Amino acid sequence: APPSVFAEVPQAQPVLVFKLTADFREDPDPRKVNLGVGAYRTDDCHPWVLPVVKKVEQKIANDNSLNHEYLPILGLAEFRSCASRLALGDDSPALKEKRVGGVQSLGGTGALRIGADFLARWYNGTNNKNTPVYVSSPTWENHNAVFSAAGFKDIRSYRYWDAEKRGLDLQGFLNDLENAPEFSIVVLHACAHNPTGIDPTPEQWKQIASVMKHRFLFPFFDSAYQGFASGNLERDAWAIRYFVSEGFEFFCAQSFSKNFGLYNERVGNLTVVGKEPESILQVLSQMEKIVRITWSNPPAQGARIVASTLSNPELFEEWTGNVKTMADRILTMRSELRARLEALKTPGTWNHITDQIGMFSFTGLNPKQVEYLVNEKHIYLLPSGRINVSGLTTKNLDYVATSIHEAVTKIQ
Amino acid sequence: APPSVFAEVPQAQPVLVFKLTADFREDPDPRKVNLGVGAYRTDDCHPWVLPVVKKVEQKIANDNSLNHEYLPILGLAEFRSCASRLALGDDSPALKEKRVGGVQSLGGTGALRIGADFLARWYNGTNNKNTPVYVSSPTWENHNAVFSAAGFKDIRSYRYWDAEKRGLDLQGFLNDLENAPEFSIVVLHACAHNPTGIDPTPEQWKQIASVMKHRFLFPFFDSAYQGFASGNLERDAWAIRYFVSEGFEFFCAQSFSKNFGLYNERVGNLTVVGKEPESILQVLSQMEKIVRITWSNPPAQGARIVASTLSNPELFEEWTGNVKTMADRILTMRSELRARLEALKTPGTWNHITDQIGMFSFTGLNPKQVEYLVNEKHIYLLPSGRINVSGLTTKNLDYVATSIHEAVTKIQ
Numbered sequence: 029a030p031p032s033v034f035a036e037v038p039q040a041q042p043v044l045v046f047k048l049t050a051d052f053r054e055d056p057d058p059r060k061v062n063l064g065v066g067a068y069r070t071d072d073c074h075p076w077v078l079p080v081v082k083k084v085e086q087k088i089a090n091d092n093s094l095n096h097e098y099l100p101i102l103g104l105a106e107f108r109s110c111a112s113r114l115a116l117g118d119d120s121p122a123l124k125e126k127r128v129g130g131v132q133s134l135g136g137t138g139a140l141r142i143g144a145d146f147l148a149r150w151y152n153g154t155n156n157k158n159t160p161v162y163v164s165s166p167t168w169e170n171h172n173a174v175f176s177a178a179g180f181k182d183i184r185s186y187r188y189w190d191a192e193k194r195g196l197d198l199q200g201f202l203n204d205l206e207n208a209p210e211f212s213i214v215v216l217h218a219c220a221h222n223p224t225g226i227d228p229t230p231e232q233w234k235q236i237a238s239v240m241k242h243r244f245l246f247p248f249f250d251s252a253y254q255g256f257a258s259g260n261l262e263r264d265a266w267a268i269r270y271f272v273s274e275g276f277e278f279f280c281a282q283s284f285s286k287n288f289g290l291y292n293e294r295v296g297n298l299t300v301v302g303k304e305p306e307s308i309l310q311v312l313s314q315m316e317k318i319v320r321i322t323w324s325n326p327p328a329q330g331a332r333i334v335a336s337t338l339s340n341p342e343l344f345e346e347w348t349g350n351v352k353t354m355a356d357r358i359l360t361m362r363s364e365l366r367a368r369l370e371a372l373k374t375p376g377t378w379n380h381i382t383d384q385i386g387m388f389s390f391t392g393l394n395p396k397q398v399e400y401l402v403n404e405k406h407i408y409l410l411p412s413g414r415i416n417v418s419g420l421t422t423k424n425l426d427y428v429a430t431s432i433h434e435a436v437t438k439i440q
Numbered sequence: 441a442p443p444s445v446f447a448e449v450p451q452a453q454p455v456l457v458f459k460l461t462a463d464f465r466e467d468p469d470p471r472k473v474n475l476g477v478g479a480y481r482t483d484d485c486h487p488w489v490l491p492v493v494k495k496v497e498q499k500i501a502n503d504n505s506l507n508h509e510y511l512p513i514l515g516l517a518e519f520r521s522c523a524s525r526l527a528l529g530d531d532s533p534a535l536k537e538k539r540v541g542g543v544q545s546l547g548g549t550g551a552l553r554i555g556a557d558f559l560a561r562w563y564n565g566t567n568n569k570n571t572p573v574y575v576s577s578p579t580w581e582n583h584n585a586v587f588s589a590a591g592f593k594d595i596r597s598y599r600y601w602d603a604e605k606r607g608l609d610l611q612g613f614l615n616d617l618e619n620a621p622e623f624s625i626v627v628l629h630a631c632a633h634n635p636t637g638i639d640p641t642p643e644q645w646k647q648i649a650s651v652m653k654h655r656f657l658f659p660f661f662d663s664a665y666q667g668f669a670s671g672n673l674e675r676d677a678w679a680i681r682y683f684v685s686e687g688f689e690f691f692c693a694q695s696f697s698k699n700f701g702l703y704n705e706r707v708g709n710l711t712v713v714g715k716e717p718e719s720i721l722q723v724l725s726q727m728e729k730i731v732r733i734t735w736s737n738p739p740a741q742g743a744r745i746v747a748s749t750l751s752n753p754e755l756f757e758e759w760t761g762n763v764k765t766m767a768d769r770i771l772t773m774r775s776e777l778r779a780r781l782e783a784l785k786t787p788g789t790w791n792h793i794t795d796q797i798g799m800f801s802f803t804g805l806n807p808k809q810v811e812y813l814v815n816e817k818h819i820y821l822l823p824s825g826r827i828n829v830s831g832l833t834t835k836n837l838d839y840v841a842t843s844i845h846e847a848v849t850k851i852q
Contacts, residue, residue, distance in 0.1 A: 037722040
């Protein structure tokens, strides 16, 4: 009869895609297409498990040597070494000189929150909750959240998407980077910009690099699709491996969710670059204490699989093949969509579709055009014109292209 | 050459046991004993993997039906149902009336931090960072930490350990519970008090129950050793299952680390009891949003094993057997130590050793006596006189008892 502490609780509300796919689920129309699904799908609209992953799982399932005792707080030793080595390169002299520790975390999200909560207490003084934060416009929906609920109360949007011409707005944001309270932190996308797909060219990275070396900035990379983006580890980590040979430091947040398909195993690593082996051991020290209060220590299964893969030469081999599979499919569905849009003389340029890298891509549509695709043609995608390219198959591709043609033409 | 943001970083320092076992590791003395190891060890001083766990792992390893796609933010559906059902009972009408959701978290630690960070924003008003916090004296070392770094700046110690007579100080803390700013939250140990082992009797629980129902308290249980403590699920969850039939509500933090041996898989559940199906769906709603910023969603492997076990009758059967194994060993090492202490006419009463429940136990020694065991007899344990009973085997038991005899007698 009396009150509920539980009553007077604000419902929280259905986020962007969660409601989107739900509507798709109940849609009885047989030509419906879901392009807002948040992982990689095959051409038959199915989840794919990497054979190299199914392979290692069997090896683990049979190793009666393994136990289930607590791991080091920072995580499985081998994993952190392999992961950072993957992002920075084996032949990186920044490894020989002992510059970096890894922290095994809970996916890419966990790498941020730990690297985030760390900065709001040891970066820019002590317990500095006022330091500005670099987020792109637009950005992965909870770059904001992970830094907000980490402390920081201003969040700063450097323009990134250029609506007209559908490409990169370089000095549109390179200029904004100048205005900022300098010496602030910058969470850059390593490659495959979520949710646009447009990455800076190596030349343009040099620009953003020096111009913000010159003048007070700390990078906080988000390497979530390394290898998964373009089908290769060497060029996807270039913007990372350049910052090291110049002589920077940064936190790099690695996610193995998309490029190992290990979404529900939450495999991730925070790579931390230094000066000299001095304070890295110091960073890693009270990185532990941050973790201890979040999760006592990280889970083992997902990490072992990645570690067993990256350490072994004939699994690494098979893995990069599997990664190239997921890759090549996306790049093909790009070249195909562009071609079909161009084959129908669809008003506008559509280079961006093939210039963008990765699984997500900005079409260049505005919610009035998108509204048409969702309600009349039952193509489900976000109002920001964002599609999951892996949502495009060989059967729906011709319908979707023609639908996009109808949208741009009929609705301005 | 220039500064390091990384320099001027405070090293954090080696905690209690981490330094303790390290010293044990380098100790060349052949009669050394480690009683500060933080998990269950066999009589041969080894980690034990439950056969029922090795069993389910094989079943999972062979189910080619499973994928690695993201789980619900709150976690694997089956797990949360089985876990809460385990703590509250299948025949609990508080389940039929839809009172409770579970939130799959990262071990027991994760269940707290989520349940903690939730209260510091929806409990006792809104964004109430001032509400007092109940922690025992002493308590599991990071009941304090998990609530501190969750916000709260006062932490209140209700006396729990009674140095002389080595047992429970009931109204010593039942009185302190009266003084507190009422309507504050209370993280009670369900059973197996870490690090003492003394649990209140069912009668004494009724006392603490009503007297703090009567007057403004919200329980926040820590069920970390359910079944693992006394070798059974029915009496270990009694203090929980009583609070529900009275008509309370609370968060219960379940850990499956010790009772499934799944430490490095980080399996845990936050059970949340309500009034009426109303605001539980509301609690679970913005429980998701708290999780999203911590870890996007929880890992699957550890949860599936527990879920597959608790849902299946002939695995549940085998599991409770394995749990009874770990249990009975501890209870035996208790009755044996007590007997050997009593057989040597060791000055003092030693009932507490056999009255305490669970893996951890307070001997009743004070660091001057403990100092003797560690430096002269190379028995490693915490200054609080805390031992890991599973550290006691059939070979060291006679040495340790005799050592404890020497400590109490020679050093007052």
